[PDB]
Structure 1
Amino acid sequence: SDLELHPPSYPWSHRGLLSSLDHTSIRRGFQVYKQVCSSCHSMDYVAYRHLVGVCYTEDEAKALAEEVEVQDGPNEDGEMFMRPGKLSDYFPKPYPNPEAARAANNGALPPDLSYIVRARHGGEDYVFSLLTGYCEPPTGVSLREGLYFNPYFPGQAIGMAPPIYNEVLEFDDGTPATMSQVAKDVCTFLRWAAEPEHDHRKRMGLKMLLMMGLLLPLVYAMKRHKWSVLKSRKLAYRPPK
């Protein structure tokens, strides 16, 4: 309450200026989103086709969309039926009205995930330190049995239960689902959903630095060459008498 603590500096694999994302790690993080987070977290801005260029393939991405039902457009009767799932749809699912989140979790909304990393202060670090760093209430501060404890939270009265060690998973090739590990991946994926352009931008940024490093001296030399006439000009004053 009016006192707070700031997150450390975790060495994410996408922390460096010219550093890509671990695309294998965005997968597992999507997996973490899919089962765990999804039941309460809306990711209104990401779609299935968005994953294609990133992690999975055309085929795989289709299939994952097919494991849900959407509520497609009306036909002849003015209906509202159900459809397998395209690639075209997004991930808006949890529940309709924001009030339903409140009715459920209790007067609290699991804030939409699509923009989280970019909306906190501290990026993935705030979220990682939150998820991983759950602890126990010290002296004299009682809660409200729905208000769990997290040091990395404004006021420290949070409405979210710690859902990171519930070891679910399909780390395909073979990756242990420890609290730490599921958290890196979930945040690595979150970075991506908040900033999908992330990699491509750093590729352009790399090129921007190389171009500039070539262009800057050259334009400078062009300009110095033209200013030469003036820099070495010599004056003399020769009055009468």
Structure 2
Amino acid sequence: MTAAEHGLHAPAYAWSHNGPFETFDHASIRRGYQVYREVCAACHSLDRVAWRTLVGVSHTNEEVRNMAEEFEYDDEPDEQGNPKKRPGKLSDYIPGPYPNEQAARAANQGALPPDLSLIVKARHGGCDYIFSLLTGYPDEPPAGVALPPGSNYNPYFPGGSIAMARVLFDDMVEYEDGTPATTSQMAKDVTTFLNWCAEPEHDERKRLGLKTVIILSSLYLLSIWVKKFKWAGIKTRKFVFNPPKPR
């Protein structure tokens, strides 16, 4: 297919977790949660991330308890059998904005916004794709395209026409640590947060990988030595042939 149908490839930005000894910037995850809650939570879901997984990664225990209690989940029905509701706890999951898929497609002009809880693993490019898609919206589509109405141009989306309009604008969120919250800074923060939501094992996985790679490299070289020590007597074997006398 053509380059427009493929989509433009995202370049290789220098993320703070690129590299085998690195770690998510956890302040970037906290700021990215704020940008998700204030902008992305209107249309996209986070169906796989429990509230308890944020405790000790980006927020404190009470800081997560209050954000969970500001929502309302389905309780077990009362003693007369009527349905009940409940303030959220740490066991519950982060609720989406829509009750079903038809409400989503009705609210967003036929297209359904994907759940973002695995979206940097579900897309070729990963963090570079999410960042470059969010900041890739030009001010005008290139001269020649026929964009369908209700759709927007973004060259990193395959085909070009995406049903998400440009959502990130300068200083639409104020961070609580006083960071200048521009478009690029907010896209960096949400992409770090979505990468944490996809791979919440990332730090421990890289740390354990350091341990196994060190132990297994040492074992490999040490086993090369023990193989050469065992096979010394066969590698240094000498054969002499005196031809036997005819009989």
Task: Calculate the TM-score normalised by the size of structure 2.
Answer: 0.93
Moved more, 67-76 or 104-113: 67-76
Task: State the 1:213 CA deviation.
Answer: 2.5
SS of the equivalent of 2:56 reads helix
Task: State the 1:17 CA deviation.
Answer: 1.7
Structure 1 residues 102-117: aligned runs within 5 Å: 102-117=105-120
Aligned-CA RMSD value? 1.5
Structure 1 residues 17-166: aligned runs within 5 Å: 17-135=20-138, 136-165=140-169
Q: List runs of 5+ in structure 2 lacking aligned partners.
A: none
SS of the equivalent of 1:49 reads coil
Task: Note the alpha carbon deviations across 1:68-102, whole angstroms, 9 max, x for none.
Answer: 22222222222332222101110132112212111
Query: For 2:65 and 2:174, how far apart are their aligned partners in 1?
Result: 18
Task: Note the alpha carbon deviations across 1:22-74, whole angstroms, 9 max, x for none.
Answer: 01101111111112111110110001100113121222111111122222222
**Is 1:5 the counterpart of 2:8 in the alignment?**
yes
Which residue of the partner structure matches residue 215 of structure 2? 211
Q: Residue type of the partner of 1:159?
A: A
**Change in CA separation of 1:155 and 1:113 when aligned onto 2, cut-off 3 Å:** same
Taking every aligned residue pair, what percent have the same amino acid on both sides?
58
**Is 1:183 the counterpart of 2:187 in the alignment?**
yes
Structure 1 residues 225-240: aligned runs within 5 Å: 225-240=229-244
Query: For 1:3 and 1:221, how far apart are their aligned partners in 2?
Result: 51
Which residue of the partner structure matches residue 198 of structure 1? 202
- 8 Å CA contact retained: 1:18, 1:205: no
Moved more, 45-54 or 140-149: 140-149
Q: List runs of 5+ in structure 1 lacking aligned partners.
A: none
Query: For 2:77 and 2:170, how far apart are their aligned partners in 1?
Result: 40
Task: State the 1:184 CA deviation.
Answer: 0.4
SS of the equivalent of 2:116 reads coil
Query: For 2:5 and 2:33, how far apart are their aligned partners in 1?
Result: 34
Q: Residue type of the partner of 2:53?
A: H
Count of residues paired in the alignment: 241
- 8 Å CA contact retained: 2:26, 2:58: yes
Query: For 1:41 and 1:3, how far apart are their aligned partners in 2?
Result: 24
- 8 Å CA contact retained: 1:46, 1:114: yes
- 8 Å CA contact retained: 1:31, 1:170: no
- 8 Å CA contact retained: 1:2, 1:155: yes
Query: For 2:233 and 2:87, how far apart are their aligned partners in 1?
Result: 75
Task: State the 1:143 CA deviation.
Answer: 2.1
SS of the equivalent of 1:10 reads coil
- 8 Å CA contact retained: 2:70, 2:87: yes
Task: State the 1:238 CA deviation.
Answer: 2.5
